[PDB]
Subunit: 215 residues, 4 copies
């Protein structure tokens, strides 16, 4: 059972201040596209909404020859969990844990996001991020139940210089990934993200494309 | 009030498997010592108990000329939160968030600890860790409510090759730290740990000593 | 002109033991292909020849809409230098500096390569590396004379487990890169490498392809 | 023999522009002190003289119970080489290789230093560094000929924020280090630095102190 709709709940804190957000979306699991609308609960954000982009659904991502491991684990209900760290060039750090429940073609996401060390005068706390650069993630399978994923991420700023980060995650599966997934390493994923936000809501879209080669 | 006793609740998961642990302890805040006993809330652990050492109370740490910022925040109840990431040389990662409540001289710790990507054949999952090397943490105060602390950590193993990690954390304070704290940077902290564990319990001791100089 | 032939001189040390290698080769600057043969002056190497892969010619890399900055800089003779760091998961490190001279369509490379801390019983020093995984490099242009390039690299080994590294470099240009090159960021590059080696010598090939998108 | 005098030759480049320095100094190998006078070869530095601090003689460093391995390698003439990498918070990097010859108690150092990616508007290239913070280096001995040393380094700057770096090195010994040295790990080294500079020259002092404990 592959997804068509999803809900999001982010909870946690930024620089010691609790925050919470809910959203709902749609996507196309055959084309790795998704979109989400989220209404900011109680007034504006005290930080750049662009910082939320990674935390705003790999179940929408197909692989070249068949289901992604993410899709397979939804389809058989065994599931996976995501444990992510992001280290920002100015010393800030975000840690995140993602858990999912499924009903038919509907995903429910419960995302714990904790951010600290954002400089009060930095681009995140002063809302100077203007967009997130397209990215390539590299995935390896150190064992049959664990994916290690790495990316070098970056945002454009109003200043003109890019705000960089290193993103690392483990994806841990309750059951082993299928042979035909494991035999194709490394696996890369190209992602494009678009965020438009106003005072009291945001609209998010992501396109993802898995590839082993470009030549 | 300075602390004299504490209790510990750790909850989270390692390699996707929930675990939970409680214990009780004592310490001397004039001398930066502590002692903790804990039982496992389910038979033996499925990983080296030595991996828990950083998660097993900086309120017991004084500074050279007065209270640590940790002590001052316990004393006036305004408090601090710890956000820690540990990256292990074999690709495992741990993220942690520490929160505290105070009842006079008593500390209640609620510690979320999430570990992923420990190789099933690695020294953590096959219990080859023998002890935690003595360590030096470097602390800087990038602003008046934030400490950034870093350390290069290592364990001895049965094979005799060290198991290394990099530890990084923010400590985020509700109230600005005192000017006299903010004046002395970098501040270093020496730590020694000992862990004795058996099948169904562990005993933990830590000594901590702040210093700006050794000459 | 665009390059058609090249020679290689690598000098430096691995774990404090000097080594030196010369080699010659050809490539197709319109397709991003190159190959190289090098005889060992003093018989089979003291470490895995696979470790040399990144050090065995971006002048053969075209860009999607015309010349790469590398090709342009060769064209006007103004040139560029590469300064590269590679950090291996077992604590080893390599630093490298590449300088080039040009005689028409022939490239002469002088590469200093210094490696240290490769454990004697590790996969490099005991020749357990079997191949270098295909890679994706992310390139940004923090200023008009500088590229910053990052890749997460990995080799296959005999014992099945991957041998990972992080590769970071600057490419520094004597004259600014063209505004047309500077406009399209990030720029990714896909690389495939092939190495075969005898007791006597080695043969190396590389295919590189630049892309801003896969969709 | 222990050292009492040294000369220095740094050669290399910063942001692809060659520089060269020669200098002369003295020190006390029983107390871990040194001083150096050094001259800028042509005109002033295009960059902060403070960036040079780590490149401006562990032979002066005694150990708590006897000679450091650095001093023992000098004494018997077998020697060691230093291979150092430094990663700066704004994306810059320096690699250095130190080689030494000895004539009795006189050291001759030949230091290759290569720096790239320092932003033209950053604190190095616009001369905003004001001092190098006191530092603690952690040393481990993964094998009997190899030290791994790590330190988190920081400078004060004119803009009211620190400029941080991560320094990593291997020190590689032509002869095995002594077992009395190999048995005590980790070993830490505390270092203090002072720098003064004019248009034509600088004066540098360092104090180093090895310690296994502070309690």
């Amino acid at each position: 059972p592959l997804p068509k709709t999803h809900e999001l709940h982010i909870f946690g804190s930024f620089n010691g201040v609790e925050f919470d957000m809910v959203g709902r979306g749609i996507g196309n699991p055959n084309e790795g596209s998704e979109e989400l609308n989220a209404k900011f609960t109680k007034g504006p954000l005290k930080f750049s909404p662009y910082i939320l982009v990674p935390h705003l659904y790999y179940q929408y991502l197909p692989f070249p020859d068949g289901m992604s491991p993410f899709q397979a684990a939804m389809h058989d209900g065994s599931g996976y969990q995501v444990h992510r760290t992001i280290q920002y060039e100015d010393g800030a750090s975000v840690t995140a844990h993602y858990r999912y429940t499924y009903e038919g073609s509907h995903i429910k996401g419960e995302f714990q996001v904790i951010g600290t060390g954002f400089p009060p005068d930095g681009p995140v706390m002063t809302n100077k991020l203007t967009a997130m650069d397209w990215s390539v993630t590299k995935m390896l399978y150190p064992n049959d139940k664990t994916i290690l994923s790495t990316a070098d991420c970056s945002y454009t700023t109003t200043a003109g210089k890019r705000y960089q980060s290193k993103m690392r995650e483990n994806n841990t599966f309750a059951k082993p990934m299928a042979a035909d997934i494991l035999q194709k390493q490394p696996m890369f994923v190209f992602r494009k993200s678009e965020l438009q936000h106003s005072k009291t809501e945001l609209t998010f879209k992501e396109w993802q494309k898995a590839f082993t080669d470009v030549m």
